[PDB]
Amino acid sequence: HHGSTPVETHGQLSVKGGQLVDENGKPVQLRGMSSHGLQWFGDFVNKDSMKWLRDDWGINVFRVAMYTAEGGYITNPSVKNKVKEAVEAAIDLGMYVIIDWHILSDNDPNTYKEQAKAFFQEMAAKYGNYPNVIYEICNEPNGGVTWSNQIKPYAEEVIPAIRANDPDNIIIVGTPTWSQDVHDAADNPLPYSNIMYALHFYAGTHGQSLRDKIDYALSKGVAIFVTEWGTSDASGNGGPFLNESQKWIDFMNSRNISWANWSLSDKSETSAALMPGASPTGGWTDSNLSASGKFVREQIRRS
């Protein structure tokens, strides 16, 4: 006997009729955690903390936020070793893993598109045969970067680079305005298989108007993955806004939208799940979790 794992249970994921489904074609919802930036909080990303999250929080997906700028991969490519550590841990543990090319201050994904293609080609060649892997090719386009003129052309360069090596694993594409404007993507979608579009919300800033954009996008037949959300405001402060977060969690459950919460770190942001000094290898009791972490853990443990 053994504890069943998410990948053992669900295998290769795909997008069918605008919905994430498993190898049996049955709907599946991933719920898990995102790291903070690997260049700052990578110590919290390892096989022990991922196993603890799987066993104690019930997560089935873990997202590694590999920043490009801000001391990330472009200037310090050694952070790729932490991505590889996390992917290999996810394989060992039967977990899904999101490899996130985490643009932010570099608000146009085209700025580092050559590095992105080479990085994703390497990851897809090494790990593309494993069902665990999900690619997230540009975290948050922002600042007036548009879908039709900037993001979609970027995706049309990166998707084939991945697909040449990994024909079937899911690719998630960011959307305008810090991955809010999923309606723009829905109106001009990528015509390739197993593509999803990212939506990011922060409960202290975003509410019904953003849920309305999501419902519009879903009505056009595209699939949405909330690869990042926080209980704080958009800037990482305030709250945590648990009443509004619950409305968002109930919405995502109703729409069978998968999600990852920011962040698995002890950063001085109210979205951070851990108290200062919490062990980087897991084993956290209630007192090691922030107000946000306690709530998120409870929500992932629910059915």
Task: Give me the active site residues, please.
Answer: 140, 228
Q: Which is nearer to Na ion, 134 or 289 (CB)?
A: 134
Report, in Å, the least distance between residue 288 CB and Na ion: 29
Q: Which is nearer to Na ion, 174 or 189 (CB)?
A: 174
Q: Which is nearer to Na ion, 44 or 225 (CB)?
A: 225
Query: Are the CB atoms for 98 and 172 separated by under 8 Å?
Result: yes
Please tell me the total number of residues recorded for the chain in this structure: 303
Q: Which is nearer to Na ion, 138 or 289 (CB)?
A: 138
In order of 107, 137, 198, the CA distances from 110 in angstroms are 9, 11, 17
Q: Which is nearer to Na ion, 65 or 296 (CB)?
A: 65
Distance between CA atoms of 147 and 137, rounded to whole angstroms? 14
Applying CB under 5 A, the residues found at the interface with Na ion are 128, 136, 139, 166, 168-169, 174, 198
Report, in Å, the least distance between residue 197 CB and Na ion: 8
Phi, psi dihedrals of residue 280, rounded to the nearest 5°: -70, -10
Report, in Å, the least distance between residue 125 CB and Na ion: 11
Residue whose tokens read 């039709």: 148
Distance between CA atoms of 6 and 120, rounded to whole angstroms? 24
Distance between CA atoms of 248 and 152, rounded to whole angstroms? 27
Query: Are the CB atoms for 31 and 259 separated by under 8 Å?
Result: yes
* Nearest CA-CA partner of 63 in 20, 29, 33: 33
Residue whose tokens read 């879903």: 218
Report, in Å, the least distance between residue 168 CB and Na ion: 4
As a dihedral over the C-alpha atoms of residue 274, residue 277, residue 283, residue 284, rounded to 10 degrees, the angle is: -40
Distance between CA atoms of 158 and 99, rounded to whole angstroms? 14
Report, in Å, the least distance between residue 296 CB and Na ion: 20
Distance between CA atoms of 250 and 252, rounded to whole angstroms? 5
